């Protein structure tokens, strides 16, 4: 029931990422000379979070006060000195409440496998690509897939001649 | 409660509007 | 259901960013001599935040007072001196309550992949572009995509001859 | 639903900024010899704010009083002196409450990309523009776009010959 | 009843992982020259979790205070010294409540078995593949299956000639 809807959601996301990669990889490598497939680890767990933050007021310069009683006594007779300080302070503090409801269906970790073809010249020899072109393909695929390191995304692009 | 803190922030928004 | 609406929202945003990039990249590079694709990491999490800020009043110059009782006693007989100061102060403080409801559907991180063609002169030789022109294309794409560093936007523009 | 309305709002704002830029850039550079595109980062977050300000009354010259009790005693017998001052003061303070509801749909950051053509004389040679003319175009575009530094606006105008 | 629905859910997930692997393994190894089967250990246990986190306030620099009473007495007569410090502090602490409902049907551990064929040249000799090609197949299968180490995923790809 709901599981099938989630699976179809994942399939559509993967297909659209695949198409976005193919769109940029087509003009330079050529139609059919590139194949990519995407798998997506998604987030279907309902989470609700409330965050409370208090600004520190331990420093007297940023401390906000409402009432303060400072009783000071010094009975000098060091000799028979007698110092007494009774201090009472009531503070008002900064407060920030944030309520967050995470979206259901977010992407947790995306791994993408891309395979490119060789280059057959007018003679027909399948000449492999170069390192610079491979790096360009890797960068383009990283851009298309929305590659990020916090998610833990992995990308692998290899070059091999396609079969007949 | 999580919903209780939601209600607290709601009453804070109410105070903001009233002011 | 709602996930499909969010996905269509993302697709429309990406398509419009793509079209905006293409619009400026067309007059100089030429029709079809530029291809770009956009992916958008969006924000579909409902957040509500209330912020309270108190202006500090620790300095006597900016401190606002309602009532103040200052009892001072000095019984000089340092000898048998006896100083006593009882101070009570009630303050009124500046207060700022901000209530914020973040919009659903905002952009978190935008990465854009742009590929340009080579230059075929009247002879037909695919002459590659220059560094200055590449920098101009990068700047134009950054302007079109709304490039920002707080979001964490990444842009990659590479030059390569298009396939037939 | 609402997201589409917000997107159309952004598109209309961007189109009108584009048209305003084109309107002034047309008479001097010429029809079609200028192309500009605008992207707008907008504010669709409902914010409500209440601000309270108290005028400081720590200086006796600007302090407003309602009731004041000053008991002073000096029993001179420094010898066996005995000074005692009990001071109680009730103040009335200036107060300013400001309630602000920010508009939904305001502009946060505007970045604009403008491209101009070269100058083809009667012979037909595409002569590039000059530094003074480029500075004039930059100033005119800044004026049209409402360029501001608090927002974080970025503008890029480059000169390049248009393609056929 | 529900068990059959869960089993069909597992079968669909396994079939889609199998198809994703086959899709990338087809262009290079060839149609029919690759066979893969997937088994999935799934999560059909309803879990509900509430998390509460308190920010530490043991350091006076990050400690937020509401009321503080500090009575200090020093009766010097080390001699007949008498120090007495009565300190009472009320703190306000940061608080974060997270409520999480894990999705039913998540993947716990995925193990995948892939078998590839030999290479029969124009002569017909079944020449085995190379180490580099085997490593490429392993990497592609890891990318397709969403291989992860936290889950405990295991992958085994072996090379052997297919039977008639």
Author numbering:
A (entry chain A), C (entry chain h), D (entry chain g), E (entry chain B): 229 to 305, 353 to 439
B (entry chain n): 3 to 21
Give the authors' words.
The bacterial flagellar motor is a huge bidirectional rotary nanomachine that drives rotation of the flagellum for bacterial motility. The cytoplasmic C ring of the flagellar motor functions as the switch complex for the rotational direction switching from counterclockwise to clockwise. The basal body is made up of the LP ring, MS ring, C ring, rod and export apparatus. Here, we present two high-resolution cryo-electron microscopy structures of the C ring-containing flagellar basal body–hook complex from Salmonella Typhimurium, which are in the default counterclockwise state and in a constitutively active CheY mutant-induced clockwise state, respectively.
To obtain the C ring-containing basal body–hook complex in the CW state, we constructed the constitutively active double mutant D13K/Y106W of CheY (hereafter referred to as CheY**), which can mimic CheY-P to tightly bind to the C ring and lock the rotational direction of the motor in the CW state. The density maps of the LP ring, MS ring, rod, hook, and export apparatus in the CW state were locally reconstructed to the higher resolutions ranging from 2.8 Å to 3.8 Å. In the intact C ring-containing basal body–hook complexes, the MS ring is more stable and harbors much more clear densities for the outer RBM1 subring, outer RBM2 subring and putative inner RBM1 subring, which are made up of 11 RBM1, 11 RBM2 and 23 RBM1 domains of FliF, respectively. In the previously determined structure of the C ring-free basal body–hook complex, 5 L1 and 5 L2 loops, which consist of residues G311–P331 and residues P309–N324 of FliF, respectively, protrude from the β-collar region of the MS ring to bind the surface of the rod for torque transmission. In the intact C ring-containing basal body–hook complexes, there is one more peptide loop L3, which consists of the residues G310–P322 of FliF and is also extended from the β-collar region of the MS ring, bound in a hydrophobic groove that is formed by the α2–α3 linking loop of FliE6 with the D0 and DC domains of FlgC1 and FlgC6 on the surface of the rod. Thus, there are totally 11 FliF loops that extend from the MS ring to bind the rod in the basal body for torque transmission. The more stable MS ring in the C ring-containing basal body–hook complexes indicates that the C ring is also important for the stability of the MS ring during motor assembly.
